[PDB]
Design a protein around this ligand. Structure first.
Ligand SMILES: [Cl-]
Ligand SMILES: [Cl-]
Ligand SMILES: [Cl-]
Lengths: 129, 129, 127, 128, 125, 127
């Protein structure tokens, strides 16, 4: 029933990897790409807006890479999704739709928004295998 | 992010129209279609599974049509969606997924399912005049 | 931007084939499926609503014919039965007129093509 | 039945905001984002191709921001959509689809293209 | 990339369950729905075309209309979702530009046409 | 049945145009856009990741433009798609889907990946 966009999935992956390595020095996009079986050049397109938003910082050099732009408990899943995908809309509200159905979509939207706004990177990084 | 189709939207429309007219005798698909500016012949494709699930009952005769198969408080948005669109719980996954990476999407899925399972036809009919 | 599904596409295929054979006796779904390289059992799922809408008639013994003259049936009539409404457009809550305007104009233009394109016109295109 | 992409919707929003503020000096992306309850960092991804196309101009400095690259009557909804989303193709045409159906998709495409090419930012900004 | 919907997914579920129970008497849609945690009334919408195509036979339950090795994923998908061959094209498409998408389409069709229910029934849980 | 993304379609178009002009000097995005009836400013959004991956090289100047970053036989359709779209996943795998269906999606994925990994720009440019 639920669909997860590639931008959102992998943008959150970058952030979670960085949260797991918080205080352990920079992490190269190359290593995140290698860990997650994807192109570093695909990942670069996702980090760019995260870097512009100050959610991540790029450290230059041979031992360079990315770090979080704030503590993991100060970044939410919602902060990340809003930068990469724009506003949250789980069910599109359509022109002249019945108020009962519009109310159902608002309730769904509020419940999704509450999950995004109450889930920090620290919380997600705490899940291990 | 949620894949509720035209089937689900209009299947909910039928159920809401019937909940608003609960205890007021049968309602024809023709009048529901007329009220909502849709083809009755599109709506007919949605009633058959709703009728098979016992969510609606067909009353024969010239003054016949449809009634709810239960009280509005005994039918949820989730009950309707499951019949018309299939399961609510499935979420897109990666093979051998790591708990940290999958977690956000599970929380979103659970929050959506909770809204759908806790919103009754009585609740939907209360959102409108 | 317009979501016409496989249902709509093949529902139009049925109607166009029947318009081409108008006044030439009944046409079986098997024949339409064979001509179009698809399953008759996929096409069967589309005929029932078209028949209920009176867009097609089933001849016992046999096959299908149009329920009206080709010039009296539009692409719009067919799409509404198989896919649902053509008008609804995705809107933002507390929408400003300037921002929504373009999408209303697009919706109206699409609806006009669908409502003014008849089966007689479409049946005149071949090969 | 009609789907509106996020890129198209919000790219068009930036342009409409700039058309409403035409002749009122530069407008920062931050204020457009604030007005529309969006991240400025989401909007940045849409403005870069619009700037590359000359549809918007960036004015530097303390009072800097964006302005339109031409008069609002000289920019169409079509000019904006082509930069952000590529070619206008409302219904995808499928291999070996019959000529009658191919014709219907072409007619829909032409009608959409006419609306896009005949609607200016001046026209859209005129709606209160 | 693929036009494989909930209809196709659950239509495959029905066929796989029936292949697993081949020669073990009829199986109801209710038990298939119970095994797979979904509505029997959603599955009921999928059986009618499978029955019309002779892929399933109705006896209170269903059996396969042929041996599991004689039914492919392609046979099932074609009935429920429509053709496998159509691919999105540009008008006046040049061969070099369309080629990759034709090759992808052919490879997908080959997987579907070469996968049988006997093969699929060997994967358990 | 098969859907082709705009990014993938046009990203591949850029690479194919460059492969056809390999050894014929630089090609501007303006001429590729003109040949393909699309905006150069839409194409520019696709070239930047391809340039970052070293799949194309930009030659500066008034007679500048793009060239391939390697020989056409050394670049695959898979190298291009992975940069622009991410991982190849034709049918999404859903939580708790039965192993028989998960296996079918893996087989589709492997067959698509084999086409992408075995098709070079030299191969495509030869048509
Ligand atoms: Cl890095
Ligand atoms: Cl700015
Ligand atoms: Cl260039």
């Amino acid at each position: 029933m639920l669909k997860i966009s590639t931008k959102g999935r992998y943008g959150l992956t970058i952030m979670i990897e960085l949260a797991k390595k918080h205080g352990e020095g920079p992490t190269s996009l190359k290593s995140i790409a290698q860990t997650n079986n994807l192109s570093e050049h695909y990942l670069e397109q996702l980090v760019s807006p995260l870097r512009n938003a100050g959610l991540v910082k790029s450290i230059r050099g041979a031992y360079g890479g990315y770090v979080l732009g704030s503590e993991p408990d100060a970044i939410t899943a919602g902060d990340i999704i809003r930068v990469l995908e724009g506003p949250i809309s789980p069910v599109e509200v359509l022109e002249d739709e019945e108020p009962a159905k519009r109310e159902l979509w608002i309730r769904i939207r509020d419940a999704v928004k509450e999950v995004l706004d109450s889930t920090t990177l620290e919380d997600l990084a705490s899940y291990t295998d």
